[PDB]
Design a protein around this ligand. Structure first.
Ligand SMILES: [Mg+2]
Ligand SMILES: [Mg+2]
Ligand SMILES: [Mg+2]
Ligand SMILES: [Mg+2]
Lengths: 204, 125, 233, 212, 195, 196, 222, 226, 196, 195
């Protein structure tokens, strides 16, 4: 009945020293029934990464929408959109459906190509921006992720240390949520290389 | 009490000329001189304040206008047409850009939007 | 299950170095009607305890009779009724707390919030809260209703933790209580200017002050406020 | 929850998952969903945890009083009916209970009674109860035979819970196995679903959909 | 409508769909084909609210047939499924939504691969090796998880499907009156007339 | 809220308490409920603070535009504009407005517009939650053609009682006097009116 | 309509060591968005080397603890001052809770102590009396924030040995009382940051063969 | 949320706490609740956070265009009028509760506005779940003719009362001072009385602790030449 | 209903209107709401007519039995018996009773028992639907130790206003005077009190 | 429980009762005997709410068996049906009623006649040549109205019953998993093991 917890799933994003990380589980469900173990919730438009939890039809719709918009942005601006600018686009787009909203929990992650500065942001379903220095969490196990991140996180982690921290935050949060899990993906993002890692986890 | 002009007033003549555009350019030619120069660390725009009377306060008539905090405009030709274009240019910088992206448009895109408004007056009814 | 009819608003209280202070206004509201202006809501039990009651007044009058009956009963076959076997704040509280929880458990509550203020045999300050649900807690400052939201923040600036109690004198504590009562009169729509205040001190005993009034009020600035935005006149 | 019990040549196999959830939140992954009523009788937990735990412990007390008075092991029929008659008295009050009472006596042989909080009492050969019951039934129905060995029957029960643990969001954690014989039940261990899944995937060639 | 199953094997997609049409008290029909051919190598089965199911299916069929004539070209199964998803995703915020769940089984002639797409009434799309809608997955997925292999033949896929239908016939309370089975491969669409 | 408007020999006086509540919390204790729609046409506001402010702002706009075209409007005209808004939007408004004004021709006039959007011209009017408690007092003590000092005393005593009994009313008693002489604001504090 | 229940917030945590047990709880008591008390003890010494906390609706929590303490007293009278073992206490608490099955004690109960072999023990109860012995259990408001962290740092879940890459799990080595207390303090510090109902103070009761000991630590007061 | 506004001698000061919450969970520990409408008109926001940001930015945008059209610095009464008429039209569905303060050629101003469109005038105001705690402090210490230093002190004390006593409020105090004939000074994290203590343990993992199935480079670059 | 009891120098006077309504229909226009529970203890009844009659009959029984055993009860005792019934049966009663009586020791006493079953000893008391309209009037005009004629005028004027504004009240104004001299009934008709 | 049928022929009463036991989503059993022998020549089939059906049937069975021992005598089917009706009629105004519908098929050894009684949960008794409960009558009564004769043999009664079951299997949405059939005559009660 609650649209934000029909399909399930989670996203977490973290900052480190000259890098950001974003990670998500792979479950799509119809309440108790597990449907797909390959439903990726992180997308990218150039070097800006967008994670989206919530109702899966809206996850897909918003990805198609922001691909549309960032493609037109690039043709007109003659440059790829930056994380700060994209965050405002996500907020505007969500708020224009204020009274019939997309049931989603978006998370932006990326590095500003000119300043080199790591950037993360989160939103509620109507577009209120949370621009955290440390971490952003989203989904049906957001409470669990808040708990993990708040204890596991420390600032200025190197990329390969940050990978371990975000992975253990996601995995152990997902294992305390019925509607999350069934595999996981972690993106480690540096200024001009991005590594994507699929994690091994319990399949129940 | 009807707007019955739903047809173009600017049309192609047999020679391929768009008469009203050419005539608009002639009106610009009669207008007072304005210029622009680009430096490495800046740009300058300038014009003559051609005062219609000495009793008029030429400070109140702004030929050089702020469009955004980092963009300015100057003209040659019909002043009233300029004034309404500045109003539309300021508003379009907000509605089609700042209210979407949370920042002011780059020069080329604001120019593109102004250009679009001027094109439409060249084809609309 | 009932609904409260005639009601009393905030009871406020705090500990200080040698005892406790408790206060409550003299109003019995009937919804938005300020019906009864001479209602005493601080009820002393012996010379060492004051029970402050808010909420339903008919239930307050029932509790008042229970406490009166408790004093009578304690005197029966008790040669030390006015000495070592006199009623303590802790005895009176535990009794009320038992009754409140029993009544909520039969789905027929006494529709009140109660604060028992007093001083024990050994000189220790007693201050504890109980309400219609049987919920209990203790703190260096306690308040019911609006008092919880407005009085506690002010009283906590004086006594913010347990170690601030020995540093707080009776003059400072009473001042803080009297100021809180003024703030509640400004801001609680079911409050009155007239109130009662009780001090229970381990040296000077029970001092019960009736017919106090909120004074030194600031209203003068109201003359300069006009309209709701654009009006100048 | 996924709980199952089935009769075969070698007695009864009982298999259960271990997960407990309050909404989406996984409260426990170490719940014991088999109640050891006594050394010869087992009960399964589905529906209400407290209701199953409490009344099946109580059932053990009644079975103990029976054999003190009658100087004879209580029958599975009689034990199950003590429980069904009890819950039937509470009908309407809101008890939640779906259980299998499992035992192996001389006069009856291996016997399973599905007992339930709205008063149902059914004897049967195969039962599955819980949110993951349908998944377990699939594996059971296609692979069940009377002439299964004790080793194969234990695996079938383990595998059927795994099937449910994978698909059903409210089932998982670990698998507890029991084998009920005439001389009593025998515990066959706690098996983590996380470790079991990968083991079963590799050895059996199943779950090709999942990347490992 | 009740049960619709799908399974993608080595070189084909098999869709199995129930034959019963029940209107409350009585079973009005026991030979109903809950499917439409969208293009020569793309088949869509459907289940959901009465009226809406067929209206939606025939509306999709018309649009894909229109696209085929305009471009003289068959859309890929992926393209057809995306089009169908968008229509359902559009539908869910309408005045009166289409309550229709679909499976789209197609053979991509460019890639030489069978493809199965599962789309619910909300517009939730997933590409799968096997899929179902409603309660059908609850009974059948444990069997498919166990027995499925990506290199199965069509005959092996049909045998695994028979086991799924048998389990449904054993444990489902409703009599769905068996299934019509259709195979989608490189040569097009054909119906298995004996099942 | 306790509000009233009273005609007298030289014109009309509007009176009001200053309390605004959200539940039992007093959101504003120094509220100004006497608001100006024209130089010598004011109103007393009761009901939804959003609604009565929105209405009053629209009326002030209508009378400003009226004045630009047709000169000074009558108090009857102002009451009519208030009524038109309140009546036509009765389903979406909770407003109880008293309109009071001074012409030289008509002198002091008072119009009350209750919830339904009806209009009632009266010698005096009372409204707001606290008015219930002073129907008896006001009916016994009102006289026509009172002096300024008598009318101030009548409003002061009346709203003193309305404040005493109504929890929703309180704070200062504001008054606005409308005569040929001009517009005079008066304020009366608790220590003054409580002891009456 | 009269609602007989309320929510006084709070968060509690029980951890069973090898030869010890801890039961910790924050000292903040609340209703809605107000603080009732910054120091209202929630974890209690019940005698016989057993510690108890009944977190949730504080009135039902106080009632249950009071009744259990009394049950310990009457156990001594009825059975010749026999020590009530932790398993026997747990079963007794089930019957106390299930006794009100159709008007429950709206609390999540945890007890801690030592079993009859001297090993650390924690038992965990739902509101109607279903219970289980556990190694690790958080209860109350911020339980969902604490338990994932404890799975990771006590039981070493999802942690494998470097170099093996998933093949060898991190071995389950025994934690000292000092190590457990660090994990308790860090759990509550983290919970305080991200949960509004958690804060003010942390009171830990430690149970060993020598008896019951208390430790107190400040938490953020916002 | 706790937000306040306090008038003083030559201007007005607003302040706010920095906690944003979803139910009982703290989403942002250092949220900025003070918004610029124009250079010298700022407001403190409470209620639905998306609604407060949206309504401020819309009116701020229209205020800027109005300022350019009229060649005049914006007035607080204009921001107030535009905010209230917008909020009234949406009948309280835009859940914005704002304290609007500023300086303009007319003088210094302080208003409140609620979601349904009602506005209010005062020398001291508070809004949000911590408003009662804040107003208690304001009612105890406010006087006429406060200096700048006294008003900043009073405003931040009122926010502290919210921070400590209201569970909906916490972390830090933001302040903005708008004095006549001066630039508005925004004091982000003016007070920081809630720094987290050092943890007992470092939770940095050994490298290789997490089990990995696959690695791959993600192409973020555009299609390449040659 | 409009009812009141007022103490004065020589004792106490109870006053009441005579109207009883079922919806908008006046079921009885000559109702007697002043009812005797003892020779010199009477009450004014408001709320459910079945409930207040049932209560009063029980009280009259209790005071008759009290008198047989212990002699004449005090007014406080009568108020206590009323309270006991109203408080203990609060869930099933809708009764608002004013108790008034004359002792020689205590003189005139008035006790009001509102819906909750609380007791409040007062110099005078007002109750019933019509009382809301005269809180202001009664507070301004009541004095202690009035004469009989002044107290009759105070009640007459007060209930006249309560009747004027409250549709639920009307008919005749009945009064009952309680003094050392005895028990006097008074009645006042519409043509008398309306013109006041 | 779903379908229970009854038919009284020349010299016997035939009761047919479904084998399925469904608990919501799944069919838990497909061999359930929804009947109790009350006495050697009296059989009662039952259908209604879970738990209540068996509890009621076994309670009736115990009382009739108690009567048999006390008097050393078998009650007539009429007497048994009246007793059962009174218990249901008592039940309907209780705190929690038995939701149970029954058919009582008996052979009266005194009168040498088969007798069928239909009693619903309210205690509504009727003696009939053929009867049913729930929706069973809706499908079957048109066939029974047509074909029934009072002088039918037991074999003719079974053939008419097969036609009724076939019509149920065709038009009912639920799979009731066939029927157990039992015959009550002068020699007692016996089950038809192949149907
Ligand atoms: Mg999970
Ligand atoms: Mg699972
Ligand atoms: Mg706080
Ligand atoms: Mg009348």
């Amino acid at each position: 009945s609650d649209p934000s917890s029909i399909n399930g799933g989670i996203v977490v994003a973290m900052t480190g020293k000259d890098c950001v990380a974003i990670a998500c589980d792979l479950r799509l469900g119809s309440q108790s029934l597990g449907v797909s173990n390959k439903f990726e919730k992180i997308f990218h438009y150039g070097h800006v990464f967008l994670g989206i939890t919530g109702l899966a039809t809206d996850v897909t719709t918003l990805n198609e929408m922001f691909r549309y918009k960032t493609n037109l942005y690039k043709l007109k601006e003659e440059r790829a959109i930056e994380p700060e600018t994209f965050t405002q686009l996500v907020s505007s787009s969500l708020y224009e459906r204020r009274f019939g909203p997309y049931f989603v929990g978006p998370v932006v992650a990326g590095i500003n190509s000119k300043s080199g500065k790591p950037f993360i942001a989160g939103f509620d379903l109507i577009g209120c921006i949370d621009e955290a220095k440390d971490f952003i969490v989203s989904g049906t196990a957001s409470d669990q992720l808040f708990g993990m991140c708040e204890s596991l996180y420390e600032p200025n982690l190197e990329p390969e240390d940050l990978f371990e921290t975000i992975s253990q935050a996601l995995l152990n949060a997902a294992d305390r949520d019925a509607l999350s899990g069934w595999g996981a993906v972690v993106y480690i993002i540096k200024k001009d290389e991005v590594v994507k890692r699929y994690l091994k986890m319990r399949q129940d | 009490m009807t707007d019955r002009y739903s047809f173009s007033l600017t049309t192609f003549s047999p020679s391929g000329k768009l008469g009203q555009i050419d005539y608009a350019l002639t009106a610009v030619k009669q207008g007072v001189t304005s210029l622009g120069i680009k430096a490495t660390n800046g740009v300058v725009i300038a014009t003559e304040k051609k005062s219609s009377s000495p009793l008029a306060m030429s400070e109140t008539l702004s030929k050089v206008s702020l469009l955004t905090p980092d963009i300015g405009a100057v003209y040659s030709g019909m002043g009233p047409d300029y004034r309404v274009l500045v109003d539309k240019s300021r508003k379009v910088a907000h509605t089609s850009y700042k209210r979407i992206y949370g920042e002011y448009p780059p020069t080329k895109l604001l120019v593109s939007e102004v250009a679009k408004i001027m094109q439409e007056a060249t084809q609309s009814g | 299950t009932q609904q409260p009819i005639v009601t009393g608003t905030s009871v406020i209280s705090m500990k200080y170095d040698n005892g406790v202070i408790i206060a409550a206004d003299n109003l019995g509201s009937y919804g938005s009607l300020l019906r009864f202006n001479g209602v005493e809501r601080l009820i002393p039990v012996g010379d060492n305890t004051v029970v402050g009651i808010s909420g339903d007044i008919s239930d307050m009058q029932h509790i008042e009779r229970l406490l009166k009956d408790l004093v009578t009963e304690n005197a029966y076959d008790n040669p030390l009724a006015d000495a070592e076997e006199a009623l303590e704040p802790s005895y009176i509280f535990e009794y009320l707390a038992t009754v409140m929880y029993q009544r909520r458990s039969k789905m027929n509550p006494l529709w009140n919030a109660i604060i028992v203020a007093g001083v024990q045999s050994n000189g220790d300050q007693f201050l504890r809260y109980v309400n219609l649900l049987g919920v209990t807690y203790s703190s260096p400052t306690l308040a019911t209703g609006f008092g919880a939201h407005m009085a506690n923040p002010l009283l906590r600036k004086v006594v913010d933790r347990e170690s601030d109690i020995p540093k707080t004198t009776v003059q400072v504590a009473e001042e803080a209580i009297v100021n809180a009562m003024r703030v509640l009169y400004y801001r609680d729509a079911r409050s009155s200017r007239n109130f009662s205040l009780a001090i229970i001190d381990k040296n000077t005993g029970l001092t019960f002050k009736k017919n106090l009034q909120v004074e030194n009020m600031k209203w003068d600035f109201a003359k300069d406020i006009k309209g709701y935005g654009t009006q100048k006149i | 929850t996924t709980t199952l019990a089935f009769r075969f040549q070698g007695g009864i196999i009982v298999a259960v998952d271990s997960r407990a959830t309050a909404g989406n939140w996984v409260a426990s992954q170490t719940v014991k969903k088999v109640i050891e009523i006594n050394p010869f009788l087992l009960g399964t937990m589905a529906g209400g945890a407290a209701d199953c735990q409490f009344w099946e412990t109580w059932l053990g007390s009644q079975c103990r009083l029976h054999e003190l008075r009658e100087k004879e092991r209580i029958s599975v029929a009689a034990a199950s009916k003590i429980l069904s008659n009890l819950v039937y008295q509470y009908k309407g009050a809101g008890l939640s209970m779906g259980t299998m009472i499992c035992g192996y006596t001389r006069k009856e042989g291996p016997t399973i009674y599905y007992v339930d909080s709205d008063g149902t009492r059914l004897k049967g050969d195969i039962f599955c109860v819980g949110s993951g019951q349908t998944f377990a039934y699939g594996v059971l129905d296609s692979n069940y035979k009377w002439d299964l060995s004790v080793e194969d029957a234990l695996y079938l029960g383990k595998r059927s819970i795994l099937a449910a643990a994978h698909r059903d969001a409210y089932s998982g954690g670990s698998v507890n196995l029991y084998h009920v014989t005439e001389d009593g039940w025998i515990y066959h261990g706690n098996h983590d679903v996380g470790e079991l899944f990968w083991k079963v995937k590799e050895e059996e060639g199943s779950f090709n959909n999942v990347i490992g | 409508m009740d049960i619709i199953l799908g399974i993608r094997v080595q070189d084909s997609v098999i869709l199995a769909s129930s034959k019963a049409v029940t209107r409350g008290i009585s079973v009005l029909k026991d030979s109903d084909d809950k499917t439409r051919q969208l293009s020569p190598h793309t088949l869509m089965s459907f289940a959901g609210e009465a009226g809406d199911t067929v209206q939606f299916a025939e509306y999709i069929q018309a649009n894909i047939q229109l696209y085929s004539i305009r471009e003289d070209y068959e859309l890929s199964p992926q393209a057809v499924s995306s089009f169908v998803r968008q229509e359902l995703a559009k539908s869910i915020r309408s005045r009166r939504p289409y309550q229709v769940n679909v499976l789209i089984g197609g053979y991509d002639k460019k890639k030489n691969k069978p493809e199965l797409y599962q789309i619910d009434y909300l517009g939730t799309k997933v590409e799968l090796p096997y899929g179902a809608h409603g309660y059908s997955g609850f009974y059948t997925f444990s069997l498919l998880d166990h027995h499925y292999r990506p290199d199965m033949t069509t005959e092996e896929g049909l045998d695994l499907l028979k086991l799924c239908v048998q389990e449904l016939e054993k444990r489902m309370p409703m009599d769905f009156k068996g299934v019509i089975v259709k195979i989608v491969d490189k040569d097009g669409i054909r119906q298995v007339d004996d099942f | 809220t306790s509000i009233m408007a009273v005609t007298f020999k030289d014109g009309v006086i509007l009176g009001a308490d200053s309390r605004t509540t959200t539940g039992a919390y007093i959101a504003n204790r120094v509220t100004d409920k006497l608001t100006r729609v024209h130089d010598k046409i004011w109103c007393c506001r009761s009901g939804s603070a959003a609604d009565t402010q929105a209405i009053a702002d629209i009326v002030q706009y209508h009378l400003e535009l009226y004045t630009s075209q047709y000169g000074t409007p009558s108090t009857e005209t102002a009451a009519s504009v208030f009524k038109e808004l309140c009546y036509e939007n009765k389903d979406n408004l909770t407003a109880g407005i008293i309109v009071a004004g001074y012409d030289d021709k008509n002198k002091g006039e008072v119009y009350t517009i209750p919830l339904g959007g009806s209009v009632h011209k009266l010698p005096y009017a009372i409204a707001g939650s606290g008015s219930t408690f002073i129907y008896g007092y006001c009916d016994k003590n009102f006289r026509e053609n009172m002096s300024k000092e008598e009318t101030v005393d009548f409003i002061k005593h009346s709203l003193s009682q309305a404040i005493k009994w109504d929890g929703s009313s309180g704070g200062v008693i504001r008054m606005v006097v409308l005569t040929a002489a001009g517009v005079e604001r008066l304020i009366f504090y608790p220590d003054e009116y409580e002891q009456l | 309509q009269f609602n007989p229940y309320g929510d006084n917030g709070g968060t509690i945590l029980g951890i069973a060591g090898e030869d010890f047990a801890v039961l910790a709880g924050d000292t903040r008591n609340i209703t809605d968005y107000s603080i009732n008390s910054r120091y209202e003890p929630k974890v209690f010494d019940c005698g016989d080397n057993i510690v108890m906390s009944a977190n949730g609706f504080a009135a039902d929590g106080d009632a249950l603890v009071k009744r259990f303490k009394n049950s310990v007293k009457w156990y001594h009278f009825d059975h010749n001052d026999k020590k009530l073992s932790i398993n026997s206490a747990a079963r007794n608490i089930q019957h106390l809770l299930y006794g009100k099955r159709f008007f429950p004690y709206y609390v999540h109960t945890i007890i801690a102590g030592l079993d009859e072999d001297g090993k650390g023990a924690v038992y965990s109860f739902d509101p109607v009396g279903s219970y289980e012995r556990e190694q690790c259990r958080a209860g109350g408001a911020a339980a969902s924030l604490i338990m994932p962290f404890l799975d990771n740092q006590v039981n070493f879940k999802n942690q494998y040995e470097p170099g093996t890459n998933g093949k060898v799990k991190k071995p389950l080595k025994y934690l000292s009382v000092e190590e457990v207390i660090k994990l308790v303090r860090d759990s509550f510090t983290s919970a305080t940051e991200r949960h509004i109902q958690v804060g003010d103070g942390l009171e830990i009761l430690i149970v060993t063969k020598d008896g019951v000991r208390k430790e107190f630590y400040e938490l953020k007061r916002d | 949320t706790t937000i306040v506004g306090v008038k003083f001698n030559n201007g007005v000061v607003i302040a706010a706490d920095t906690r944003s919450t979803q139910g009982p969970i703290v989403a942002d520990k250092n949220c900025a609740k003070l918004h610029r409408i124009s250079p010298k008109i700022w407001c403190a926001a409470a209620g639905t956070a998306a609604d407060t940001e949206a309504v401020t930015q819309l009116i701020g945008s229209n205020i800027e265009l109005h300022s350019l059209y009229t060649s005049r610095e914006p007035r607080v009464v204009s921001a107030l009028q535009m905010l209230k008429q917008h909020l009234f039209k949406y009948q309280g569905h835009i859940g914005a509760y704002l304290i609007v303060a500023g300086v303009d050629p007319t003088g210094s101003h302080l208003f409140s506005i609620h979601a349904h469109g009602s506005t209010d005038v005062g020398y001291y105001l508070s809004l949000g779940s911590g408003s009662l705690a804040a107003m208690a402090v304001l009612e105890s210490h406010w006087k006429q003719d406060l200096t700048k230093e006294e008003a900043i002190k009073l405003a931040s004390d009122a926010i502290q009362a919210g921070i400590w006593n209201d569970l909906g409020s916490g972390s830090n105090v933001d302040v903005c001072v708008m004095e006549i004939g001066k630039d508005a000074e925004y004091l982000r994290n003016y007070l920081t009385p809630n720094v987290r203590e050092e943890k007992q343990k470092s939770y940095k993992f050994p490298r290789g602790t997490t089990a990995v199935l696959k690695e791959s480079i993600v192409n973020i670059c555009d299609i390449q030449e040659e």
